[PDB]
């Protein structure tokens, strides 16, 4: 059981840097690249094999490729703390940026970087033995993560196809944005994020900012706390493969229990308890309130209002001190509650899974260490809501032919902007049909 992780773009590799720090701290791996022990209480030995492949003797090298067009953050990583940890070739760096340009990323510099990326991933997969699947980390607002992200996804689908591809994507928030042409970029990326990813999990930044303001009461959060929380979420959802527990689920369970139709795969994520060191020692942590907080929309990583929508199906990973008794009690309470409502074409809409190892804390982080935690991943129509909110501001700019000459200059035809608009409209129509 092994899963590989690719990161594309700036945000992608920063989330991955955070994830890999967390993974090393979980598995007891020094930044040198060697585990100085065999105690490994965990769930068992050979747990690391799912992320770190043991090489040579007493040496563990991660199953990942960071890749980027601008060399700056790649060589910051190269010069930082985990030099001796990543393989020198695993980090891949272009020479110039894609610069917030989907066309520049998809047709100008993809055509030189993606072949190298693919023939590196091929030997990674070949070294691998029981590959579960790929997990991609990218941001759709930028140029790299958008254009050559989609290029790499197309090429992965044509190479392998039947293997799972978990895309934890960063979407643009409704009002928060650090770009201008990101609506164009998001639409051109979703055109292929629809029919190439199998399970796509959105993360906005405004929702995480609100979370960090309210719960963790950090008044001045940077991207580091966002990345640490995203790494925690990823770790919680892969703990089931990593350690053993009362009721485990692999990667192949999300595609089975959360994707009722091959086109409706866009998942709200959530996490609880997001709690600071003072609020830990003052709130009592039981399973009931954390299952209630996982659904209260003040604790979701995507800014949307599920009271406007209806849940298709949800998945609940539990970590730590959990027996099935209280988790069944809490799920029955939730199902009987009426402030949230399920779609009638799905009477039983929950998939629970439990793992015994509690979540770990990175020193310097702002999350306390807790008895237990919950990672919620649902499916609803807040996503079609989000898509329309985004389509509106895309069409606003496209009515006046703004910024179009860049893309047309970089080899993207004007017609593309019409068929991606139509694709998004068809996706909206499908969502509205299915919700009834």
């Amino acid at each position: 059981r092994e899963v590989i992780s690719i990161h594309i773009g700036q945000a992608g590799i920063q989330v991955g840097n955070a994830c890999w720090e967390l993974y090393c701290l979980e598995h007891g791996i020094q930044p040198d690249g060697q585990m100085p022990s065999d105690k490994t209480i965990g769930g068992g030995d050979d747990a690391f094999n799912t992320f770190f492949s043991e090489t040579g003797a007493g040496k563990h090298v991660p199953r990942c490729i960071f890749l980027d067009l601008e060399p700056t953050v790649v060589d910051e990583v190269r010069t930082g703390t985990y030099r001796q940890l990543f393989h020198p070739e695993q980090l891949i760096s272009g020479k110039e940026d894609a610069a917030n340009n989907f066309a520049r990323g998809h047709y100008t510099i993809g055509k030189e970087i993606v072949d190298l990326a693919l023939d590196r991933i091929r030997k990674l997969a070949d070294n691998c033995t029981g590959l579960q699947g790929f997990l991609v980390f990218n941001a759709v607002g930028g140029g790299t993560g958008s254009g050559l992200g989609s290029l790499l996804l197309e090429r992965l689908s044509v190479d392998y196809g039947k293997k799972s591809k978990l895309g934890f994507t960063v979407y643009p928030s409704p009002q928060v944005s650090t770009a201008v042409v990101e609506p164009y970029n998001s639409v051109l990326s979703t055109h292929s994020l629809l029919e190439h990813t199998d399970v796509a999990v959105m993360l906005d930044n405004e929702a995480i900012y609100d979370i960090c303001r309210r719960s963790l009461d950090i008044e001045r959060p940077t991207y580091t706390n966002l990345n640490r929380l995203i790494a925690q979420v990823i770790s919680s959802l892969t703990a089931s493969l990593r350690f053993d527990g009362a009721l485990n689920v692999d990667i192949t369970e999300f595609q089975t229990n959360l994707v009722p139709y091959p086109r409706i795969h866009f998942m709200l994520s959530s996490y609880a308890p997001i709690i600071s060191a003072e609020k830990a020692y003052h709130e009592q942590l039981s399973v009931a309130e954390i299952t209630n907080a996982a659904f209260e929309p003040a604790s979701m990583m995507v800014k949307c209002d599920p009271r406007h929508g209806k849940y298709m199906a949800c998945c609940l990973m539990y970590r730590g001190d959990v027996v099935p008794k209280d988790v069944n009690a809490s799920v029955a309470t939730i199902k009987t509650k009426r402030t949230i409502q399920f779609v009638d074409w799905c009477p039983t809409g929950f998939k629970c899974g439990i793992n015994y190892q509690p979540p770990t804390v990175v020193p310097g982080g702002d999350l306390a260490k807790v008895q237990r935690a919950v990672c919620m991943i649902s499916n609803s129509t807040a996503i079609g809501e989000i898509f329309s909110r985004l389509d509106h501001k895309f069409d606003l700019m496209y009515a006046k032919r703004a910024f179009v000459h860049w893309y047309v200059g970089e080899g993207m035809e004007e017609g593309e902007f019409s068929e991606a608009r139509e694709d998004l409209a068809a996706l909206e129509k499908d969502f509205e049909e299915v919700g009834a």
């Binding site: 040198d32 690249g33 060697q34 040579g56 003797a57 007493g58 040496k59 001796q84």
Partner: peptide, 19 residues
């Protein structure tokens, strides 16, 4: 500046005890 623990096969390449 911390030394790493090499594999036994590369840390004792050509060392041979001789009696």
């Amino acid at each position: 500046d911390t030394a790493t623990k090499l594999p036994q096969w590369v840390e004792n390449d050509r060392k041979v005890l001789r009696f």
